[PDB]
Design a binder for this molecule. Structure first.
Ligand SMILES: Nc1ncnc2c1ncn2[C@@H]1O[C@H](COP(=O)(O)OP(=O)(O)CP(=O)(O)O)[C@@H](O)[C@H]1O
Length: 276
């Protein structure tokens, strides 16, 4: 159940569009003056082959997944527009976590790093409590949008970009490609099954990057086959700094366990992060 918005329920402000299947624009809800980011579907007759034009399949999935999600730490879907098909999302004003962590001259202060860790944990906790659980499959720092970096803000971080997401009463499967964020059972083949526990591993890498300001596995360099084999068969993981608080170190280490069953439920993750 998602609301339909006309053309004159929203007024555009400007474009901003680094988007997977069309443009992104900033605008406003005429009713609220709620600020809003509008993602359009554009097939584009010329460039793409028939196979690539879906990609209508991705836009559709993102709508269907988002339609049931309502939580403060998940980017909210306000409505749908037609001609062209568009998702109207809440506008999140402070960019994304990946680009913020690149600013090394201005490191994020510790209390704000814990706010970010907990906000993202609460959003994934909510996903994993859905029936059936939502599997995002693309959790990484560019897909964490920052609402505010004030440590007393109601909401600092939100989970975004559910285009690859699954919610099935069956086994989930599919090879995943950004490998330094993805669980080992997802990077070997199309062939093997896995669950929401693959997102719990990605969340470990998000804890790592917030802790250190550095990209997961950037301390290693290997050819692609050897890198995958090391992560899958030799337990290769990023090095957690010696000064990491021990409760955070344990949460990260359990969350990136090679055995998906050993990665904790989010009620345990949330409790431990709240005690830091
Ligand atoms: N809800 C939102 N709030 C604010 N900005 C948004 C937004 N949704 C998208 N954007 C902005 O529009 C640009 C395009 O976003 P999009 O959602 O297409 O990410 P992306 O497809 O580039 C993920 P990646 O490139 O890592 O695969 C983003 O870089 C961001 O600046």
């Amino acid at each position: 159940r998602l609301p339909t918005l006309a053309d004159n329920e929203i007024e555009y402000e400007k474009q901003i569009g680094k988007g997977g299947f069309g443009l992104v624009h900033k605008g406003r809800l005429v009713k609220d003056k709620s600020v809003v980011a509008i993602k359009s579907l554009i097939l584009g007759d010329s460039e793409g082959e028939t196979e690539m034009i879906e990609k209508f399949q991705e836009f559709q999935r993102e709508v269907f997944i988002m339609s049931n999600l309502n939580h403060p730490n998940i980017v909210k879907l306000y409505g749908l527009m037609h001609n062209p098909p568009r998702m109207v999302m809440e506008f999140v004003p402070c960019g994304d976590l990946y680009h913020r962590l690149l600013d090394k001259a201005h490191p994020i202060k510790w209390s704000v790093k814990l706010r970010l860790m907990l906000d993202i944990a609460l959003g994934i906790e909510y996903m994993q409590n859905q029936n059936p659980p939502i599997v995002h499959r693309d959790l990484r720092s560019p897909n964490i949008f920052l609402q505010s970096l004030d440590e007393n803000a109601p909401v600092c971080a939100k989970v975004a970009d559910f285009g690859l997401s699954q919610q099935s009463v069956h086994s989930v499967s599919g090879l995943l490609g950004n490998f330094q964020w993805m669980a080992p059972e997802t990077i070997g083949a199309e062939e093997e099954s896995y669950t929401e526990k693959a997102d719990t591993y990605s969340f470990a890498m998000i804890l790592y990057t917030i802790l250190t300001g550095e990209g997961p596995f950037d301390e290693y360099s290997y050819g692609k086959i050897k890198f995958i084999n090391m992560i899958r068969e030799e337990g290769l993981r990023p090095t957690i700094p010696e000064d990491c608080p021990p409760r955070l170190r344990n949460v990260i280490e359990l969350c990136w366990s090679g055995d998906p069953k050993k990665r904790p439920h989010f009620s345990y993750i949330v409790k431990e992060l709240s005690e830091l």
